[PDB]
Amino acid sequence: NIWGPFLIISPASTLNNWHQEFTRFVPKFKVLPYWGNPHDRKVIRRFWS
DNA sequence: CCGAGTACATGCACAGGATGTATATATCTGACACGTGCCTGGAGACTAGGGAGTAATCCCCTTGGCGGTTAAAA
């Protein structure tokens, strides 16, 4: 389950806190949340698709 | 066997929050905007000459106005 994808459901206000705590926690793992508008959905679609 | 009541289910209303929307603002840039002198094609003034249509008659057709008949409108 390490190499597999993991979807974490967190609030929009705690997304930055989980991103900072995840970056300072495990820097070897990439943190790529999902937020924004249709443009950010196109960027996340180009990167994650 | 029937009525009272307690419990569970449910539905509606209100408030929070997220996302879509639209305008307010910022900024560097193509383009309006503004001199600077050129000049040559225009724009007008000034004599002289032409000419066609306005104006007044007046002769002459083509309108606008009378009474019936059936044919089309109702």
Short description:
The chain has helices at residues 15-25, 38-48. It is built from two helices and no strands.
Explain the overall architecture:
This protein is mostly helical. It has helices at 15-25, 38-48. The protein contains two helices and no strands. 0% of the residues are buried. It is 45% helix and 0% strand. The structure holds one DNA strand of 74 nucleotides.
Q: How are the elements arranged and paired?
A:
Layout: H1 15-25, H2 38-48
This protein binds one DNA strand of 74 nucleotides through loops.
Structural class, by secondary structure, is: mainly alpha
How many beta-strand segments?
0
Which geometry do the CA atoms define? globular
Radius of gyration: 12 Å
Query: Considering DSSP H and I runs of 4 or more, what fraction of the residues is helical?
Result: 40-55%
Distance between the termini: 20 Å
Q: Secondary-structure element order, as H and E?
A: HH
**Main sheet summary:** none
Tell me the number of helical segments per DSSP (H or I, 4 or more residues long): 2
In percent terms, what proportion of residues is strand? Answer: under 5%
